[PDB]
Amino acid sequence: QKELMNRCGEMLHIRYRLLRQALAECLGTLILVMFGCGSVAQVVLSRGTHGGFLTINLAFGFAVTLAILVAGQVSGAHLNPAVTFAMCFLAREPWIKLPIYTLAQTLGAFLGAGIVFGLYYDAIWAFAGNELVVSGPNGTAGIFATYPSGHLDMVNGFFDQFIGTAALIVCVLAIVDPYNNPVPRGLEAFTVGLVVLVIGTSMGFNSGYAVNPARDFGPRLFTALAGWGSEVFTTGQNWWWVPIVSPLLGSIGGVFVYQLMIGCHLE
Amino acid sequence: QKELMNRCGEMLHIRYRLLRQALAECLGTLILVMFGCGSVAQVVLSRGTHGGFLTINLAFGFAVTLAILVAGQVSGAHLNPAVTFAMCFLAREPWIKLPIYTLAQTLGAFLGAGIVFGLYYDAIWAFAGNELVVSGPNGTAGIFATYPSGHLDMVNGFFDQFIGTAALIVCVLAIVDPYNNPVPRGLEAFTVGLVVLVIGTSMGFNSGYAVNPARDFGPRLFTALAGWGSEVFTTGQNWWWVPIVSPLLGSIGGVFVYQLMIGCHLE
Amino acid sequence: QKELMNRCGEMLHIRYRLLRQALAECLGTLILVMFGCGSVAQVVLSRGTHGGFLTINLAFGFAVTLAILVAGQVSGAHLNPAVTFAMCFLAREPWIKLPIYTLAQTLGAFLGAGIVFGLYYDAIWAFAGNELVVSGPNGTAGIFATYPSGHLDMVNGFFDQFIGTAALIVCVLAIVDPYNNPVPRGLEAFTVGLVVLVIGTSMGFNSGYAVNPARDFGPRLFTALAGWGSEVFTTGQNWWWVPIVSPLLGSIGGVFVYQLMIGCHLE
Amino acid sequence: QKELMNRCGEMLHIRYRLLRQALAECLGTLILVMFGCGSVAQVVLSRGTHGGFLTINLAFGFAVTLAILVAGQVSGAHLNPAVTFAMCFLAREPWIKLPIYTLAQTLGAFLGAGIVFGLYYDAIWAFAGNELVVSGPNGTAGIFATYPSGHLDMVNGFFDQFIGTAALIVCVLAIVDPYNNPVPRGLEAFTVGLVVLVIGTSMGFNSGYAVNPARDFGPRLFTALAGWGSEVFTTGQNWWWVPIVSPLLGSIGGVFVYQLMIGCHLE
């Protein structure tokens, strides 16, 4: 039966490399969101019975590792518009793929929310008694997108994502640096996956350590059309744009931090 | 004394390769079930005193790694009829070993339940006061097999295992792909073990993330003969066939997902 | 100042290899017990405030990895009389070092208890109000040695350690097998450290997953002389000999299990 | 745009190697403190809702791994004056960089506290109602620096840090030993990161497993100027000097322990 599989492989073969990389980013971000947002639903819908916040940190951290193992060889497994912006800002990848990856990263993250919604369709609907509440004691929209806590304000929420994304790029840039290799080559999947693991355990209290415009805006746009309504965007004094603008500004901020102390003074 | 050991080794040497691989699968699935179902008994019989659900996720995830380290070099450490079905569907392994591995995977998983039952013989019997209850406040059958929760329905339970198994095959296929190696070769034990770790932390709320017909039907058949009675099969509106049919359909579904976006468009 | 260090190194150089390996086993078991029994004191004296049972599993599992990294190159990091008995039974190491390693493993484990006692000297004494209680609500002897639970009986306690040690040897033998290498060579520290991690999360409910005569009898003998009295040995219907006799019988039982299915039918 | 980046790289290039290593230590300790002290604020300000003590252990343990991945190739990622003192005492690194690294390690740790303070500015101020309390039910100074518990005394606190640092150097020396390599070269980031993980789970109950004069005195000096006042230094019967003097004495104590049993008797 290998003759049919090889025949199907040659027909479905994609000549365009750019579209091949965008297809890998859709599945790479799908795994990250399905295994990440699905973990939140496991600890929110169960009210902590099936795990606490450490379950979210372990699943979100190791979902990046698995997403890198899946789409790393094809597209580089950027998995983040802030990460893609950092690579483009460093003259490492063409600027033409910045909107291509972002469009391919928002998708898949949007699809990953639909998979999580279909995975917990009965639990989500029975959480608030055949109704959808954006936030509160029976809030269900917090599973997909990230929302500020009661203590968090508008100014602190901006710097919460800025520091989270800057610390992500600083650690990511050191891993992907060709001249900075304190670890044998090929272990970039586990090392980058540890960065998201310690970010959730350190800066995941204010909002939910989004630090990813695709991971946040993607499922947030899904919840608007799924039935949560327009209240998703207006929650937290129009919080929806904070996990988008701030991580982009945090990427260039984290690019400068690494380059000024270690990146430029190497070799 | 090495002369006797070498003499015993040559006598016990098995010429048939297929039977050698089936013998490895029996011990490979035995370790997976003994260390997996034993973890559930540690957190169910102790009522959360000796660990929560994160204990189950860590033990189930790392039991696959140890089972791969034990039987990986001999049989490939399929450890799953859905995984074996995916390999056969991809023209990677002969179809003759699909029933051979499944028979060898149900066994060992059945034996692994007996080892767990003998490990917690006093705790299981004293859990309900010298009696066996399939489900409820003193339910003991949920340690071995997986049962749906109160919120889970018949339709959602089918798609809960379908999504769990499809996400397992997608991540497994990327690891075992000869042309998709973002990680140095030989680390397949740890990478696959992380897939089960994040599946339990993401989709382990609805039923218990079976995603393995051998890991579910094996000990479930043990509980029927151990003393739990025929109520094990009739619990949850005849739930016993869901962790069997759905993961098989989820394997081919997950095979298509990986091949269409990354698998076919490689090299 | 390197001249003095090199001069001191040549003077202190040990010609005897057997005594060099015994010295490594004393420090190897010291790290395992200090980081293992110290973890129990962190969650028992704090009444779960500074960690649950998962803290014990992670610390005990990763203490074996660090002890292997410290004494692996010198003595092989057996760290267990049952493991040493398995190697001697397999004609891999001389029988002369079976009592030498056991004497060197009981020591260090005894010293590791003294370090833990001095680490938590104030917490241990203030736990019961300037008194030492072997077991109960204010029990402090359970930190060092392992004691059966209320549900555990004499017969089940024997098979609890037998299954725990047999599963340890089966996974250890597959790692140290020269012809069974599904993982790149040199990762034996992390792979063996995962075996103890999943044993604590699976079979650590009945008694405390001793599965190590040196790790159990060592600090238990320390508690008798530290002030706990002879009640340590008579607790649990003379439980002290169960974590000694059973793991030794479980090592040869686990040796046969691996050899009959995978060990003999290799290459 | 690569022409501008290369032009900027040559201008910003640093000729002095010693200043290049000090710049790496500032960012290396910054990551360790930002991801370490930020984890404490995640579990203290949330009152355990967003994680327990295991969150601190995982974040502190893996922050050393990420800090080594960032500054390991440049300065060696000492990250600890006790570690730097151990290297200088072993005639491995020049004594001239002992005050240079310590000054560069206190900084960054001081800056890491400011980043954590700005990350949780609203949560810290709202924790005690627009006020700063050093210790108590609303204590906020314990996030940055380490303070003794109620049971801990002056004598035990000295030996709590002595044992913690000695066990750290013993495990660190075995990893960085050129002649003691039971693990493939290059995995020093993960192996050292496991040492801090098991130290927090074993000896992190008495004070908070400081075992690092830079990680403790750095943010402690920040809290004095941030608004906590001079009570930070006088808390716990002048505890501030214990995490400074004791780890330095524990480094040479741990140097002797490893050298006498394994270090000297090698090759």
JSON list of N, CA, C and O in Angstrom, two decimals, chain A residues 2 31 34 37 57 126 154 241:
[
{"chain": "A", "resi": 2, "resn": "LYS", "atom": "N", "xyz": [2.18, 1.06, -0.01]},
{"chain": "A", "resi": 2, "resn": "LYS", "atom": "CA", "xyz": [3.10, 2.20, -0.03]},
{"chain": "A", "resi": 2, "resn": "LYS", "atom": "C", "xyz": [3.06, 2.93, -1.36]},
{"chain": "A", "resi": 2, "resn": "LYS", "atom": "O", "xyz": [3.41, 4.12, -1.43]},
{"chain": "A", "resi": 31, "resn": "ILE", "atom": "N", "xyz": [-1.39, 23.40, 18.38]},
{"chain": "A", "resi": 31, "resn": "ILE", "atom": "CA", "xyz": [-0.99, 22.54, 19.49]},
{"chain": "A", "resi": 31, "resn": "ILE", "atom": "C", "xyz": [-0.74, 23.37, 20.75]},
{"chain": "A", "resi": 31, "resn": "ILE", "atom": "O", "xyz": [-1.12, 22.98, 21.86]},
{"chain": "A", "resi": 34, "resn": "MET", "atom": "N", "xyz": [-4.33, 24.51, 21.92]},
{"chain": "A", "resi": 34, "resn": "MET", "atom": "CA", "xyz": [-5.16, 23.39, 22.34]},
{"chain": "A", "resi": 34, "resn": "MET", "atom": "C", "xyz": [-4.66, 22.78, 23.64]},
{"chain": "A", "resi": 34, "resn": "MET", "atom": "O", "xyz": [-5.45, 22.45, 24.53]},
{"chain": "A", "resi": 37, "resn": "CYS", "atom": "N", "xyz": [-4.79, 26.31, 26.33]},
{"chain": "A", "resi": 37, "resn": "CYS", "atom": "CA", "xyz": [-6.12, 26.72, 26.76]},
{"chain": "A", "resi": 37, "resn": "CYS", "atom": "C", "xyz": [-6.94, 25.54, 27.28]},
{"chain": "A", "resi": 37, "resn": "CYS", "atom": "O", "xyz": [-7.82, 25.73, 28.12]},
{"chain": "A", "resi": 57, "resn": "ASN", "atom": "N", "xyz": [0.94, 25.87, 34.22]},
{"chain": "A", "resi": 57, "resn": "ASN", "atom": "CA", "xyz": [2.33, 26.20, 33.92]},
{"chain": "A", "resi": 57, "resn": "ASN", "atom": "C", "xyz": [3.05, 25.04, 33.23]},
{"chain": "A", "resi": 57, "resn": "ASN", "atom": "O", "xyz": [3.80, 25.25, 32.28]},
{"chain": "A", "resi": 126, "resn": "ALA", "atom": "N", "xyz": [-22.53, 23.69, 31.12]},
{"chain": "A", "resi": 126, "resn": "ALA", "atom": "CA", "xyz": [-23.04, 23.39, 32.45]},
{"chain": "A", "resi": 126, "resn": "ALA", "atom": "C", "xyz": [-22.32, 24.17, 33.55]},
{"chain": "A", "resi": 126, "resn": "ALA", "atom": "O", "xyz": [-22.74, 24.09, 34.71]},
{"chain": "A", "resi": 154, "resn": "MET", "atom": "N", "xyz": [-4.62, 49.47, 34.62]},
{"chain": "A", "resi": 154, "resn": "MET", "atom": "CA", "xyz": [-4.30, 49.65, 33.21]},
{"chain": "A", "resi": 154, "resn": "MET", "atom": "C", "xyz": [-2.80, 49.84, 33.01]},
{"chain": "A", "resi": 154, "resn": "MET", "atom": "O", "xyz": [-2.22, 49.29, 32.06]},
{"chain": "A", "resi": 241, "resn": "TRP", "atom": "N", "xyz": [-6.46, 44.94, 23.80]},
{"chain": "A", "resi": 241, "resn": "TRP", "atom": "CA", "xyz": [-5.29, 45.41, 23.06]},
{"chain": "A", "resi": 241, "resn": "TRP", "atom": "C", "xyz": [-4.00, 45.35, 23.86]},
{"chain": "A", "resi": 241, "resn": "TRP", "atom": "O", "xyz": [-2.92, 45.49, 23.28]}
]
